Design a protein around this nucleic acid. Structure first.
Ligand SMILES: [Mg+2]
Ligand SMILES: [Mg+2]
Ligand SMILES: [Mg+2]
Ligand SMILES: [Mg+2]
Ligand SMILES: [Mg+2]
Ligand SMILES: [Mg+2]
Length: 327
DNA sequence: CCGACAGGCGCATCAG
DNA sequence: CTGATGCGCAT
DNA sequence: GTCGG
């Protein structure tokens, strides 16, 4: 498919190994950073030296690229692919709620297959049990046509609960993607600000309404501001059912919507890059605020923010529309 | 060369 | 029980 | 694994 697709596939597979098997989060991030910068690079890479000029690509990745270019493979990966333990741990982490730690522990206890998981429900926590239940469905992508039907349901049902709610579909959907891995919904209500919560159960009431109409089907986790769960579009007579889909809802302080929507629009790599750039500039950005850093690494008071662009301006970045925050 | 690497919610668990 | 910590997850 | 001080 893609211009340096071989290289970026290699690097992403190395990232996953470092995260899932090595449990080295900074090496995972370093590989993902390199994969992203190479994926955006508009030339077919001819050497590692050429790749090394990109920020995030260093000596070790440049050497892997030289290997890959010459031979069409990487020995280091060819050996990870035949390592039984690595391969089993990597597979189990595909279940939502099983991470590197739980996968290694399962693999040590003799559980390394889907079949093994499916006769050991009792060793799984609630999240894992649901991740297993919908293992196949959760790896299917959601065409934009279906994302549009799902937006319509969520926005109309939210409006039924209280007309003052605003629900914004974020993630890859807001970035214009033709398909999405899941549905991300940012929610606000005027009664929840950074200064005051003057209504309880604001997130709960929306979740309950979506359960009532059979859109939300399962709950992975749920607190006062974050819901993680499962939903499904209604199917019509004699049609196969739609796959079950992952849904995330985040209730954000209304007056902090712009930091909220910046966060929830991503991409994840974009947010890391942006937040890392903020730190270089003497600021810290989360889903609520952008704050200056003081001398001794302590965060100051929130800066006024009136648009997404305001946050970009503070770190002296030219604005990027959501569609230009992908990959 | 070597600190630092994005930020935080919800859940599960440990020490007391 | 609270407070701390790690895990898995979200972008 | 990479990079800025
Ligand atoms: Mg470089
Ligand atoms: Mg997993
Ligand atoms: Mg998403
Ligand atoms: Mg994602
Ligand atoms: Mg999501
Ligand atoms: Mg059904």
């Amino acid at each position: 498919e893609t211009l340096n697709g071989g290289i970026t596939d290699m690097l992403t597979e190395l990232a996953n190994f470092e995260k899932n098997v090595s449990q080295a989060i900074h090496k995972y991030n370093a590989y993902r950073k390199a994969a992203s910068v190479i994926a955006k690079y508009p030339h077919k890479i001819k050497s590692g030296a050429e790749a090394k000029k990109l920020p995030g690509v260093g000596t070790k990745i440049a050497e892997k690229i030289d290997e890959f270019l010459a031979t069409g493979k990487l020995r280091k990966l060819e050996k990870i692919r035949q390592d039984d333990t690595s391969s089993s741990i990597n597979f189990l982490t595909r279940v939502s709620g099983i991470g590197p730690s739980a996968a290694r522990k399962f693999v040590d206890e003799g559980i390394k297959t889907l079949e093994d998981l499916r006769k050991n429900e009792d060793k799984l926590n609630h999240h894992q049990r649901i991740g297993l239940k919908y293992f196949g469905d959760f790896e299917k992508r959601i065409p934009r046509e279906e994302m549009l039907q799902m937006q319509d349901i969520v926005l109309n049902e939210v409006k039924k609960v209280d007309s003052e709610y605003i629900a914004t579909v974020c993630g890859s959907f807001r970035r214009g993607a033709e398909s999405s891995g899941d549905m991300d919904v940012l929610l606000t209500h005027p009664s929840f600000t950074s200064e005051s919560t003057k209504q309880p159960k604001l997130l709960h009431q929306v979740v309950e309404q979506l359960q009532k109409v059979h859109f939300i089907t399962d709950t992975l986790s749920k607190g006062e501001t974050k819901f993680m769960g499962v939903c499904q579009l209604p199917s019509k007579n004699d049609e196969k059912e739609y796959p079950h889909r992952r849904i995330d809802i985040r209730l954000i302080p209304k007056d902090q919507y712009y930091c909220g929507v910046l966060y929830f629009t991503g991409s994840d790599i974009f947010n890391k890059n942006m937040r890392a750039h903020a730190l270089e500039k003497g600021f810290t950005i989360n889903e609520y605020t952008i704050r200056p850093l003081g001398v001794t690494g302590v965060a100051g008071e929130p800066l006024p923010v009136d648009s997404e662009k305001d946050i970009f301006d503070y770190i002296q970045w030219k604005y990027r529309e959501p569609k230009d925050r992908s990959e």
